[PDB]
C-alpha cells in the first residue's frame, strides 16, 4: 500500500524536524517512554513522558503524524548516546515497526540517506525491540543486514539499492532512524 508507506515517509521528515526543535533548548532528548499503551484519543492527552503524545501537545505533530500506518501503533521514540560510555541522550532514535521486505526497502531507500544512523531490525507491530532495551548506540559498528550507517569509525556508508536488498531480509522487518 503505496499511500501508506508515503505517508509513514513523510511523516518521517515531520518527526525529525519536531524532536530537533522541541528538544533544542534543552541540549538532550526524552527517554523512552512506550506510545503501545496510546489510543487515537490519549495521543492528544497522556503525561507519562511519550515523545510522540509531547510533539502533538505541543503542535510540532498531528495526532496521525505519530502513528505508523502500516503497524497501526504510535510510533516509538527514545533516546541515543553519542559517545561509548555516555548516559546523556545526546541523540533520539524513532522505530518504524511491522514492515513487510517490500514495505521496509522501500522506507530505507527513500529516508535512509536523511539520517546519521540507520539500523534494521524485526520489531513487530505491537513492539519497540530497538528501543524498549535503552538508549541507541549510535556508534555501533556498521555491518551487512542490521547496522546500516551509523557514528561509527567507517559508519557513513552510503546505502545503495543493493545494499537494501541485503537487509529487510526477514519476514517482518523493522527501521530505526537516529539522529544528534
Given at each position: 500500500?503505496?499511500?501508506?508507506?508515503?505517508?509513514?515517509?513523510?511523516?518521517?521528515?515531520?518527526?525529525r524536524?519536531?524532536?530537533?526543535?522541541?528538544?533544542?533548548?534543552?541540549?538532550?532528548?526524552?527517554?523512552?517512554?512506550?506510545?503501545?499503551?496510546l489510543?487515537?484519543?490519549?495521543?492528544?492527552?497522556?503525561?507519562?513522558?511519550?515523545?510522540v503524545?509531547?510533539?502533538?501537545?505541543?503542535?510540532?505533530?498531528?495526532?496521525?503524524?505519530?502513528?505508523?500506518?502500516?503497524?497501526?501503533?504510535?510510533?516509538?521514540?527514545?533516546?541515543?548516546?553519542?559517545?561509548?560510555?555516555?548516559?546523556?541522550?545526546?541523540?533520539?532514535?524513532?522505530?518504524?515497526?511491522?514492515?513487510?521486505?517490500?514495505?521496509?526497502?522501500?522506507?530505507?531507500?527513500?529516508?535512509?540517506?536523511?539520517?546519521?544512523?540507520?539500523?534494521?531490525?524485526?520489531?513487530?507491530?505491537?513492539?519497540?525491540?530497538?528501543?524498549?532495551?535503552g538508549?541507541?548506540?549510535?556508534?555501533?559498528?556498521?555491518?551487512?543486514?542490521?547496522?546500516?550507517?551509523?557514528?561509527?569509525?567507517?559508519?557513513?556508508?552510503?546505502?545503495?539499492?543493493?545494499?537494501?536488498?541485503?537487509?529487510?531480509?526477514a519476514?517482518?522487518?523493522?527501521?530505526?532512524?537516529?539522529?544528534?
Open positions: 500500500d503505496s499511500r501508506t508507506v508515503s505517508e509513514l515517509v513523510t511523516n518521517t521528515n515531520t518527526i524536524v519536531a524532536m530537533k526543535d522541541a528538544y533544542q533548548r534543552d541540549g538532550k532528548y526524552p527517554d523512552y517512554q512506550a506510545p503501545l499503551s489510543t487515537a484519543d490519549s495521543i492528544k492527552t497522556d503525561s507519562t513522558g511519550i515523545a503524545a509531547q510533539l502533538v501537545q505541543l503542535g510540532k505533530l498531528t495526532p496521525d503524524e505519530a502513528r505508523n500506518g502500516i503497524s497501526g501503533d504510535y510510533i516509538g521514540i527514545g533516546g541515543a548516546i553519542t559517545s561509548s560510555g555516555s548516559t546523556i541522550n545526546k541523540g533520539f532514535a524513532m522505530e518504524l515497526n511491522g514492515l513487510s521486505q517490500e514495505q521496509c526497502r522501500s522506507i530505507l531507500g527513500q529516508v535512509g540517506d536523511n539520517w546519521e544512523y540507520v539500523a534494521v531490525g524485526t520489531s513487530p507491530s505491537g513492539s519497540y525491540d530497538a528501543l524498549s532495551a538508549a541507541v548506540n549510535m556508534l555501533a559498528a556498521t555491518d551487512n543486514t542490521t547496522i546500516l550507517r551509523s557514528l561509527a569509525a567507517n559508519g557513513q556508508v552510503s546505502l545503495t539499492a543493493e545494499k537494501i536488498l541485503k537487509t529487510c531480509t519476514t517482518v522487518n523493522s527501521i530505526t532512524l537516529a539522529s544528534r
